[PDB]
Amino acid sequence: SGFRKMAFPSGKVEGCMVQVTCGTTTLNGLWLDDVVYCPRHVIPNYEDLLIRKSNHNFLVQAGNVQLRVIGHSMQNCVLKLKVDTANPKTPKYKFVRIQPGQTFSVLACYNGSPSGVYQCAMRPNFTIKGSFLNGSCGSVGFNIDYDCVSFCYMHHMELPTGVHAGTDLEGNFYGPFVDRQTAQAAGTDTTITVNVLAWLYAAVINGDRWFLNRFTTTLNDFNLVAMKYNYEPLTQDHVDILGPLSAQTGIAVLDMCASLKELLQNGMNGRTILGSALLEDEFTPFDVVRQCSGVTF
Amino acid sequence: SGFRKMAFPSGKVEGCMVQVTCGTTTLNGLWLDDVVYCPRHVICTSEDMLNPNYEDLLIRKSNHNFLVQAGNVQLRVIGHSMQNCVLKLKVDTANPKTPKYKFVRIQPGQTFSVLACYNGSPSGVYQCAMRPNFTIKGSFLNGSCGSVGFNIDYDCVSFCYMHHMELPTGVHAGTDLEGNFYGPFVDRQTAQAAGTDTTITVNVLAWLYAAVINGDRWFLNRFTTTLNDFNLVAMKYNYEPLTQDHVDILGPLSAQTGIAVLDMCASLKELLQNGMNGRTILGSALLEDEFTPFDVVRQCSG
Ligand SMILES: CCc1cc(Cl)cc(CC(=O)Nc2cncc3ccccc23)c1
Ligand SMILES: [Cl-]
């Protein structure tokens, strides 16, 4: 029993964190094989700024060992520093771009040193509601599938609202953001509907049933109600994804939708679900299965 | 900016997780140097649950009864001893991945990270607080026994918890790494109930200071309170009494934000009286009590 916002074990990613210093800026790098990846803002015309840099300008530190940079290239908003040594601790990895609603773990680092791990969701407005201080740039978001680390995020900046913006590991920003000091605002956020439903299934698996009702709804009637409460549209794909949870608990997806519809129009009435007074949307349907069945890494 | 329930990086602890099998029972072990630590109930049978004699059960075991597996390598048990409710299996190989570590017993209200494992394999990491009733509200399934709670302050891992059992309410009970249970709990399947839980007041206040540091001020009021008047109100809402030690501990946050502890106490008194009124504090509609004053300073400063 129990439901917690659980992150993936961070060990495979900790073995990749390095400190990258260029001039006055110090941030984090992801050392995989003989390449160190980091935000290009460590060096604006970035092609022009990068052509003025030499390999010895970037001081890369892996623990108490200095890595010598033997090349540098830029891919979108990510800087790739070719180093002489391949990271022995390099795990089986992939660079994956995630979609909004998808969750991932963040290993927050300061000076190439991991200090915390937390679980995040890519908001529908493409920002993450992270926890970052100055120096966290280059910190990475990841998932683990079997023994493979899927790197999906690199932290680049904090928006004026305290939310975070970054890129995938190929340097492509999530959201309409740019890596420079200018007026940039996060768009109006919406609730990840499929994730709230998955979390309602997790509450039922944990014995919380007060919100369940005898009613069902059509997907269209649910989406008309969801739109009114700033909830993301629930697609037929989402229903199919929720299928195993629907089968396990005996509550049809449109039947849980009718519970969610009532929860939105009426509220919780001083009641809680999994110790929360808000509807939680940072657990995907897969996260609920993984946590409520026991998958290990 | 931003406030998250953050766990310590689990890598140093992952390098210590092993699988311990004794008969039909398989649980987790913590392999540090040449010793594997695990709950002593790994040696219990079906009829040795209600009233087991662990000294008697352990004397009947030989080193070859304990199958210890570290990854795909079997470790050779060369000795066994029991310290309170933990079993110590001396092995023939010292763990190369053994970090700089300490065994620390924590007090209620204290937080720690839990590395949940099944079959000696880490599957997730989450943040926990030792509840005032000495239970933890964890997320554990069958096979999680032997999973550990820790804090990684600087480069040293302070092991503070080992999971042992789930109480009838879905809450969890375990020991420190010396085998001493937290609370009035025993490793027997006898009727055991967690005591009435209370809110860790000092932690809610620390989290209110975290919200102020993050720009949230709506809950602040023009009032202050005496420590006694605050406790008289706090008790009525099942909040732990706030001691002078707690007031002292909140001192740095009080100095950083400019809000006196008894002033922040009057804000908490009002929040208990009024509720949130459809508002949130740090994205939460409930008062959060699993962030200690030390957690708030570490996350909001470094
Ligand atoms: C009542 C008998 C008993 C006494 C003792 Cl000394 C130990 C256990 C084992 C136990 O509680 N294991 C588990 C841990 N966490 C969560 C669990 C969820 C489901 C099933 C087991 C779970 C059981
Ligand atoms: Cl403590």
Side-chain angles (χ1 to χ4, degrees), chain A residues 1, chain B residues 41 44 49 54 118 139-145 163-167 171-172 181 186-190 192:
Chain A
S1 313
Chain B
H41 69 72
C44 299
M49 299 261 58
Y54 291 102
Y118 299 92
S139 184
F140 291 123
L141 302 172
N142 211 5
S144 56
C145 299
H163 181 58
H164 277 74
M165 61 191 202
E166 185 172 288
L167 300 179
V171 297
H172 304 104
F181 257 93
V186 296
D187 50 354
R188 286 159 65 202
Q189 81 133 307
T190 195
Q192 302 185 69

Side-chain angles (χ1 to χ4, degrees), chain A residues 195-203 273-274 276 278-280 283 288:
Chain A
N195 286 10
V196 171
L197 291 161
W199 173 83
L200 287 174
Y201 279 112
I273 302 170
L274 291 171
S276 180
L278 293 178
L279 296 168
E280 178 65 52
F283 288 97
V288 167

